[PDB]
């Protein structure tokens with residue numbers, strides 16, 4: 001079976017499975033109620049997210065989920081990542097119980113909060129004020145950088161860092177998801193929501209199958225661009241075939257509208273050809289911290 005880990009094992013009868021949250025990478029994820037996740041409050045309800053094997057899963061799918069579980073045990077706890085809460089490995093299906101972020105992923109969060117165009121009638125003194133302000137976008141960027149910096153300190157490379165893979169809590173805290181098959185990537189693969197994940201890959205990863213923390217920094221720069229386009233799709237209108245040759249030529253995305261040169265500056269730094277010429281996550285946290293303090 002699977003060994004028992006009393007440090008993490010949670011009785012499965014203390015879960016009530018609820019609404020499916022969609023296809024997770026290695027299985028499906030369901031919202032759930034947990035009673036007594038805090039052992040000091042055994043009858044207290046909390047909302048959690050539960051990852052489990054899809055129907056008719058292989059022995060490989062089990063291996064993947066179990067390895068994701070073991071990664072999460074190892075990396076420890078941080079404010080800006082999805083944290084492991086517990087597991088159900090005994091006498092029933094494998095459950096991996098993690099934090100549930102009320103507002104969904106960062107890309108959807110941004111796209112849903114785009115400002116009103118000059119389309120609707122002025123109603124109220126804030127008719128043109130959108131939900132999102134510059135300091136809060138910078139805070140989103142800063143928090144992801146702090147999460148990535150933690151992950152890096154734990155020798156963890158993400159390899160798909162993208163806004164879709166950051167979740168947003170009720171208090172607008174960013175939590176990096178799915179930090180733990182690079183030899184088979186379909187670079188033409190479009191996800192069911194229309195995403196082309198090749199557009200987040202560093203040149204060395206895409207061309208040479210090399211991943212480092214500086215590869216993630218490249219992706220971070222793409223995520224920066226998503227934020228300051230409020231959830232835009234990178235390399236707009238560029239199909240994958242054209243992306244290959246544009247990247248070989250050293251092409252980079254344009255500065256987006258309503259983005260200050262400080263932030264487009266950091267994006268271009270993240271996309272320097274040589275990985276040693278990109279900022280480290282520690283440098284990105286510091287740089288974003290300066291902008292955040294300057295504007296708060």
Ligand SMILES: */C=C\C(=O)Nc1ccccc1Nc1ncc2c(n1)N(CCc1ccc(NC(=O)C=C)cc1)C(=O)N(c1cc(OC)cc(OC)c1)C2
Pocket residue numbers: 021022023024025029031047048049050051068069072082096098099100101102103104105160164165167176177178179180
């Ligand atoms: C809490 C109320 C709620 O339901 N919120 C909600 C509504 C709709 C969508 C998403 C959420 N909130 C939420 N919160 C935490 C987690 C998740 N969702 N999911 C599902 C969404 C998701 C995120 C990232 C995905 N990655 C990729 O597609 C590619 C990398 C896919 C789907 C979720 O999967 N998790 C989750 C995260 C991790 O990160 C380590 C690990 C696990 O299981 C081990 C699950 C959390």
